[PDB]
Each structure stands twice: as structure tokens, then as C-alpha cells.
Amino acid sequence: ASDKYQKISQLEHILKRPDTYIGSVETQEQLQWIYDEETDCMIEKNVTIVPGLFKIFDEILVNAADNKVRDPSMKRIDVNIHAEEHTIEVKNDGKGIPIEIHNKENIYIPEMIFGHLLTSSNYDDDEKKVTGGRNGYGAKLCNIFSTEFILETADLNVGQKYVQKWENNMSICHPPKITSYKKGPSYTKVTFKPDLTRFGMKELDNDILGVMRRRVYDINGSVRDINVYLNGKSLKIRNFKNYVELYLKSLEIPTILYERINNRWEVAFAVSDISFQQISFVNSIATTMGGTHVNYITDQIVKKISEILKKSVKSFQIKNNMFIFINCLIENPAFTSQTKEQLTTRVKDFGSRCEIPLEYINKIMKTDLATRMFEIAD
Amino acid sequence: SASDKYQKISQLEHILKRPDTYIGSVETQEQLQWIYDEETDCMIEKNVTIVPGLFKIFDEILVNAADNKVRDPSMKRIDVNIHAEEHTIEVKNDGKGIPIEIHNKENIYIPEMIFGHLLTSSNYDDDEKKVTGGRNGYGAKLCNIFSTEFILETADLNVGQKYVQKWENNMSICHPPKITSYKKGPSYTKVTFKPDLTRFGMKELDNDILGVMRRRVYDINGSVRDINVYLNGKSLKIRNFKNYVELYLKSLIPTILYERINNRWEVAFAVSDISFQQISFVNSIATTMGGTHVNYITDQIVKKISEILKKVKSFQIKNNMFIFINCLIENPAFTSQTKEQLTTRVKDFGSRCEIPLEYINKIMKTDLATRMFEIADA
Numbered sequence: 001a002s003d004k005y006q007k008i009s010q011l012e013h014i015l016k017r018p019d020t021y022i023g024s025v026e027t028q029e030q031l032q033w034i035y036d037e038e039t040d041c042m043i044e045k046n047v048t049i050v051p052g053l054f055k056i057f058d059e060i061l062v063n064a065a066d067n068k069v070r071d072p073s074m075k076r077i078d079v080n081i082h083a084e085e086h087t088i089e090v091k092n093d094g095k096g097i098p099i100e101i102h103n104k105e106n107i108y109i110p111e112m113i114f115g116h117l118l119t120s121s122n123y124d125d126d127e128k129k130v131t132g133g134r135n136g137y138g139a140k141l142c143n144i145f146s147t148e149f150i151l152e153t154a155d156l157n158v159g160q161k162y163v164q165k166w167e168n169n170m171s172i173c174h175p176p177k178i179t180s181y182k183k184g185p186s187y188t189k190v191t192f193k194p195d196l197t198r199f200g201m202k203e204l205d206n207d208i209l210g211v212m213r214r215r216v217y218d219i220n221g222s223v224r225d226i227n228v229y230l231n232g233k234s235l236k237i238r239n240f241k242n243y244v245e246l247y248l249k250s251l252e253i254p255t256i257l258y259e260r261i262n263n264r265w266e267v268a269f270a271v272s273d274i275s276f277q278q279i280s281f282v283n284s285i286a287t288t289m290g291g292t293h294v295n296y297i298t299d300q301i302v303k304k305i306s307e308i309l310k311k312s313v314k315s316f317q318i319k320n321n322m323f324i325f326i327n328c329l330i331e332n333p334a335f336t337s338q339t340k341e342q343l344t345t346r347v348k349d350f351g352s353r354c355e356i357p358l359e360y361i362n363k364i365m366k367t368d369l370a371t372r373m374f375e376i377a378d
Numbered sequence: 379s380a381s382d383k384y385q386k387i388s389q390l391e392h393i394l395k396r397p398d399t400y401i402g403s404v405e406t407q408e409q410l411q412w413i414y415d416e417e418t419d420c421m422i423e424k425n426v427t428i429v430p431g432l433f434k435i436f437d438e439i440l441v442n443a444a445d446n447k448v449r450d451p452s453m454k455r456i457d458v459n460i461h462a463e464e465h466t467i468e469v470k471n472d473g474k475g476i477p478i479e480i481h482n483k484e485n486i487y488i489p490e491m492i493f494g495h496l497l498t499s500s501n502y503d504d505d506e507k508k509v510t511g512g513r514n515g516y517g518a519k520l521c522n523i524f525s526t527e528f529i530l531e532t533a534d535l536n537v538g539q540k541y542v543q544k545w546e547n548n549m550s551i552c553h554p555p556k557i558t559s560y561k562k563g564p565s566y567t568k569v570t571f572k573p574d575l576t577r578f579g580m581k582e583l584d585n586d587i588l589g590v591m592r593r594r595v596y597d598i599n600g601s602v603r604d605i606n607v608y609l610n611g612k613s614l615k616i617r618n619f620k621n622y623v624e625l626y627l628k629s630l631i632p633t634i635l636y637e638r639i640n641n642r643w644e645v646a647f648a649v650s651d652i653s654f655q656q657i658s659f660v661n662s663i664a665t666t667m668g669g670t671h672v673n674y675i676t677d678q679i680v681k682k683i684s685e686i687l688k689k690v691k692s693f694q695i696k697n698n699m700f701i702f703i704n705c706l707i708e709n710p711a712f713t714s715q716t717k718e719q720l721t722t723r724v725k726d727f728g729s730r731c732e733i734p735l736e737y738i739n740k741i742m743k744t745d746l747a748t749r750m751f752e753i754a755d756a
């Protein structure tokens with residue numbers, strides 16, 4: 001009976017069952033937005049991508065964005081994708097990783113938080129934080145799903161440079177090379193080579209490159225006060241309104257209605273062609289499966305439109321003519337999984353509210369939505 | 379401070395600190411839930427306030443018992459006894475028990491191993507295509523971890539012994555098993571737990587959680603073939619999925635249209651009053667957030683209706699449907715440990731489910747058709 005039952009390690013379970021950590025490691029046929037460089041705008045495309053591969057990139061991206069929360073003096077993210085060499089680099093400025101041996105773990109802190117599961121600066125929820133990072137997995141998950149993983153950082157308090165290489169799904173950990181550093185700014189650079197074989201791929205194809213690239217545009221659109229560079233090119237999205245307007249050409253009384261509701265909430269609206277559509281971000285994370293924040297906003301808009309039509313029309317008819325954009329900040333958010341695709345935090349625990357002004361719903365009532373809704377009623 | 383800022387925690391510590399991706403929220407949630415009304419012998423939808431994590435730890439034990447029918451098709455009986463006043467919950471199943479044997483690798487008794495250590499399972503070899511609900515080797519331990527007291531009792535006829543082992547204080551206390559001679563009796567497994575109500579923000583099991591727990595036991599009777607289920611000694615009476623779906627009749631040409639499509643798929647249909655509704659089961663797991671199996675079935679029905687209608691938008695057809703699905707899926711994958719949403723691709727199901735024209739024609743005899751013709755004319 002012994003063979004019937006097995007005990008496995010945390011690390012073994014991640015490699016065996018990637019789904020709850022990074023999403024599927026199988027190819028998925030998806031309708032995805034990508035940024036078209038020739039038309040300088042968003043295009044919806046049928047792609048085939050491996051979610052887990054996109055997600056290990058996303059983990060490093062959101063970590064960089066989180067450092068802007070930790071250090072508001074940070075000014076730039078650099079993303080460099082070397083397709084041919086399957087190598088991806090993510091660099092941020094502002095404060096680096098402290099080059100110190102940890103009191104308890106007795107290893108260098110960078111080795112600790114990039115090379116050991118369940119390590120985080122986000123474990124003390126006494127503090128209400130608007131970082132995306134929550135559970136102490138993201139960076140290690142990337143490491144685990146890489147043939148090679150390199151952490152480079154510079155710390156000004158100690159005046160040192162720190163380079164550490166992991167290999168073979170985080171199973172090989174080389175000692176760090178630490179050198180002297182009085183060379184300008186602090187920074188962190190993460191350089192990884194995904195285990196493409198683990199994702200059933202031989203190379204980075206145009207589909208995955210397209211969505212990776214677009215995700216970088218997302219970061220620029222959702223995070224304020226940073227410059228975002230992709231393969232050397234400054235993306236120069238000035239704000240979330242500018243980001244949403246990248247979708248303008250494809251969608252085509254304004255086509256997009258944008259409003260900043262408060263310091264933690266921005267929303268945009270457009271009329272949807274076939275069914276309900278949403279693009280939303282919580283603390284820079286792309287909530288592709290929506291959740292409590294999306295529902296909080298849409299419910300308000302649908303509720304009011306229903307009242308207007310009443311003085312015949314079911315709520316679903318209203319909702320399915322809506323394309324909503326949301327950029328929001330939520331305190332200590334909770335999600336259905338590590339992939340953080342769906343927010344579960346109750347509204348009352350958001351740390352803020354977003355009461356959509358009646359005048360904004362009035363503007364929605366001038367769009368094609370109302371004409372469609374008055375045809376069903378009358 | 380840097381040592382205080384960055385923390386390493388154990389897997390056990392993480393589960394208790396951050397329950398969400400393991401068992402769901404430990405905060406109260408307002409939910410619309412189906413309840414079994416005993417006075418009117420039917421399902422009724424009620425607004426309830428429950429703690430999802432508490433409901434979930436109960437569900438893990440229920441699904442484990444259901445899984446034993448796959449292991450041993452001769453299993454006939456599940457008893458669920460809720461002693462509200464004592465907040466003790468018991469789940470007992472007959473058929474083959476847990477082997478009372480020292481594991482050849484782990485060097486401890488198998489029950490101690492698979493109920494008292496994380497990441498232990500008989501479901502880690504996916505070379506076998508199984509239709510068990512169990513996948514990750516967490517479920518039983520999660521219940522234990524969120525219990526003040528957790529008792530496994532089992533009888534094993536191969537060694538002719540009975541085994542009783544008690545854990546206390548969130549699995550932190552593991553008492554040695556009591557093993558006794560057991561001759562001339564049936565095999566069985568009985569799990570008895572007292573949920574750590576302090577960790578769920580509760581003092582007692584109120585009517586809302588009891589109602590939802592009891593309904594979940596009806597689900598099990600409805601979804602598991604050829605078993606008899608009891609709640610506090612009282613037979614649940616239903617024998618199959620058709621019977622189960624019929625419990626919803628009073629709330630909902632027949633009102634409900636049911637068909638077994640094959641040995642792994644049953645589907646029932648009713649006209650929905652407000653919007654799209656689904657009740658679905660994968661390997662006896664309640665997939666309350668739907669997923670690929672639900673989409674597979676509904677896409678077909680929608681596509682087939684749409685083709686006949688034009689001889690209207692897809693969401694208009696979809697949202698007049700109430701779909702019931704009971705299916706068996708090979709080695710399923712889900713968004714999280716809570717298994718609310720199936721992600722397995724259709725091609726990986728291990729079977730197919732083509733909805734026949736006869737079934738579609740019968741749907742076209744219901745209110746859905748005349749509602750669609752109303753939209754078509756205008």
C-alpha cells in the first residue's frame with residue numbers, strides 16, 4: 001500500500017502542478033490585446049500562448065512596479081527582451097536590495113528573497129500597503145521556471161554590487177559575486193531565461209512577445225511618475241487616460257469616457273460590440289478575471305441605468321453592452337490564487353470608496369448603449 | 379530593520395496567515411446561496427452570511443469521502459453528522475478504509491502521513507487517468523490545520539485492525555494512534571473535526587452556515603452515483619442527479635429537461651428568470667465559478683440555438699438559460715485549491731459531450747424560444 005501514497009516537497013509540487021501558482025503550462029487559444037507598433041495602437045488578436053510563461057514575466061514586472069510604492073524617488077523601469085537568446089531583463093532604479101546577511105536566516109538577503117520560497121517584505125499586514133506583492137512567491141516562481149536566473153543589485157548604504165546566478169529550475173545556486181560600488185545610482189536588475197521546454201516551446205514566438213510587450217505598456221499606463229523603456233524605446237504613456245486611448249482606433253459623443261474619481265480610482269467607459277468587456281488593474285496587477293472591484297463599479301452603473309429605463313430591461317442586457325476600464329489601488333488585496341487574476345477583497349476592506357457621479361452615468365446615457373436599451377424597452 | 383523587513387515563513391505559517399488561496403476567505407461574505415428547505419422539501423435561494431473557509435474545510439472532507447467511491451465502487455453509504463451545539467462535524471464512509479501500515483519511505487503509519495503532513499496524496503501519479511476530485515494533497519490537512527481537534531478513525535480488514543488518531547490545535551499536536559484488533563466488522567473511515575471557530579471569526583455554527591453545509595451534502599448525494607447519504611441519521615432520499623435537479627423545481631412542456639448524454643456527462647436545462655445561472659459538478663466538486671466544462675456545454679447550446687434562430691446576440695440566449703451539469707473529468711486542473719473553476723482544456727477532458735439536436739429542439743419548445751423571437755422581431 002506504500003506505493004499508493006506519496007509525500008512531495010513544495011518545490012516538487014510547483015513543478016508537478018504549476019496551475020495554482022503561475023497558471024496553465026499548456027497552450028491556450030486566447031483573444032488578446034497587443035500593441036501594434038506600425039499603427040501605434042491596441043489591436044485585438046487571436047493568439048496561442050502559455051499563461052505560465054506570461055505570468056513568470058508578469059511577476060518580475062509587478063515587483064519592479066512595487067518598488068515605486070516602496071521608493072517614490074524611483075523613476076524608470078527598463079524591460080529588454082532578447083527573443084533569439086530567450087533572455088529577459090527587467091531593471092528598475094530607486095532603492096536596490098539591501099546587501100546584508102539576514103539576522104535569522106544567516107544568508108544574504110537577496111539570496112533569501114529570490115532563492116527561497118515564502119520570503120517577503122509583505123507579510124506584516126498591520127501596515128496597510130498598496131503594493132501588488134502579497135505572498136512571497138512571485139520572484140521564486142520565475143526562478144523555478146527558468147533554466148538560468150540572475151539577480152543584480154547595488155546598495156548605496158554599503159557601497160557594493162551583488163550578482164548571483166541560479167540554474168536548473170532554482171536547483172543550482174551559485175555563491176554571490178560582491179564587488180565595490182561608488183558608481184552613481186542604486187538599482188535592481190533581474191535577468192532570466194525561461195525553461196521554455198517546461199512550457200512546451202522551443203523559442204519565444206510572436207504571440208508571446210506581443211503580449212509580453214503589451215504588458216509593459218500596461219505598466220506605464222497604470223503606474224504614475226515613472227518612465228518605461230522597452231528594448232531601449234521610451235513608451236511615454238503620460239497617464240491612464242492616454243493608456244485607454246490606445247484602444248480608441250480599434251473600438252472605432254466620445255468613444256471613450258474617462259474620469260478620475262479620486263486619488264485611488266480611475267474609470268473609463270466605451271460601448272461594447274458583442275458582450276461585457278473589462279480591462280482592470282489593482283496595484284498595477286492585471287485583473288484579467290475581474291472581481292470585487294470590477295463588480296463594485298459595474299453594479300453602480302448598471303443599477304442606475306436600470307432605474308432610468310424603468311421610468312422591461314434585464315440587468316444583463318445593460319452590462320453586456322459595456323466595456324469598462326478600471327485603474328485602482330486596494331489595501332492589502334486578496335485574490336483567488338497566486339496569479340492574482342481575480343480580486344476577492346470585500347468593498348468595505350478596500351481602504352477607499354468609488355462613488356460614480358450621476359453626471360458620469362449621464363454621459364454613458366448619451367452613447368449607443370442607451371439607444372440599444374431604449375429599443376429593447378420601447 | 380532590514381532583517382525585520384524581510385521575513386521567511388513556513389508553509390504551515392503561511393496557510394494560517396493567508397488562508398485565501400488554500401481554503402478561501404476567513405472573513406464573512408454576503409452570498410446568494412441555495413438552501414434545502416425541509417418544510418417545503420425543495421431548494422430555495424436565500425441571502426446568507428457565511429465564512430467561505432469554514433464551508434470549504436467541510437467540503438474537503440465530503441469530497442474525500444466521495445472520492446472513495448471511485449477507489450472502491452462497492453461503497454454504499456456516507457453519514458454526515460453535524461452537532462451544532464458541540465460544533466463537531468463527523469463524516470463517515472463505508473467501503474475500503476485507510477491502510478493501517480507503516481509507509482516504506484516515510485516510516486510512519488499511512489493515516490498519520492496522509493492526514494498529518496502537507497503535500498501527501500494518492501493522486502500524484504498522473505500517468506493514471508483518474509476521475510477523483512482529489513488532486514493536490516492538501517485538502518484533509520487544511521481541515522486539520524483549521525480545526526481545534528481532528529480525529530481520523532479507520533478499519534482495515536487486510537491487517538484486521540482499527541486505527542484512531544487525534545490531532546489538536548491546528549494540527550500542531552499529533553497524538554500517537556490507538557491501534558486495536560478489529561475482527562468480523564466492515565471497513566470504513568470516519569473523520570471527526572471541531573473547526574477552529576476563532577480563526578473564522580465565529581462563536582458558534584449559525585443557521586446560515588448549517589444551511590449551506592446541509593445543502594452541500596445533498597449535492598454529494600446528487601453527484602455521486604449509487605450511494606446512500608445521511609444527514610444526522612436521516613436519509614436524504616435522492617438517488618441520482620435527476621432527483622437532485624428536481625429539488626430545484628419549485629423555485630424554477632416540462633420545467634426541467636434532463637438527459638444523461640453518456641456515462642461521464644449529465645445535463646439538465648431550465649429557463650432562467652433573470653440571467654445566466656449554472657450549477658455544476660466536476661468529480662463531485664462544486665464548481666461554483668464554472669469553467670471550461672460549463673463553457674463547453676453552454677457554447678454548444680448557444681451556437682445551436684443561434685443557428686436555428688437565424689434560419690440575436692449570443693449573450694441574450696445564454697442569459698435565459700439555467701444549466702445543470704454533472705461530469706467526470708480526467709485529472710482536472712483548477713484556478714486554485716478551492717477548485718471553484720475548472721481550467722482543463724476540453725481536449726484534455728478524457729471524454730466528450732455532444733448535445734444532441736433532440737435536446738436543442740426541446741429547449742426550443744420552452745419560454746427561451748419565445749423570448750428570443752421577441753428580440754428577433756424587434
Ligand SMILES: Nc1ncnc2c1ncn2[C@@H]1O[C@H](COP(=O)(O)OP(=O)(O)NP(=O)(O)O)[C@@H](O)[C@H]1O
Binds near residue numbers: 063113122133135
Ligand atoms: N525589483 C525589486 N526591487 C526591490 N525589491 C524587490 C524587487 N523584487 C522583489 N523584491 C523583494 O523581494 C521580495 C520577494 O518578491 P516576491 O517573490 O515577488 O514576493 P512578493 O512580491 O512579496 N509577493 P508575491 O509576488 O505576491 O508572491 C519582495 O517582497 C520584495 O521585498
Ligand SMILES: Nc1ncnc2c1ncn2[C@@H]1O[C@H](COP(=O)(O)OP(=O)(O)NP(=O)(O)O)[C@@H](O)[C@H]1O
Binds near residue numbers: 474501
Ligand atoms: N474518506 C477517505 N477514504 C479513503 N481515503 C481517503 C479519505 N480521505 C482522504 N483519503 C486519502 O488521503 C489522501 C489525502 O487527502 P487530501 O489531503 O484531501 O488530498 P487529496 O484528496 O488527494 N487532494 P486535494 O483534496 O485536492 O488536496 C488522499 O489522496 C486520499 O488517498
Ligand SMILES: [Mg+2]
Binds near residue numbers: 134
Ligand atoms: Mg512579487
Ligand SMILES: [Mg+2]
Binds near residue numbers: 512516518
Ligand atoms: Mg482531498
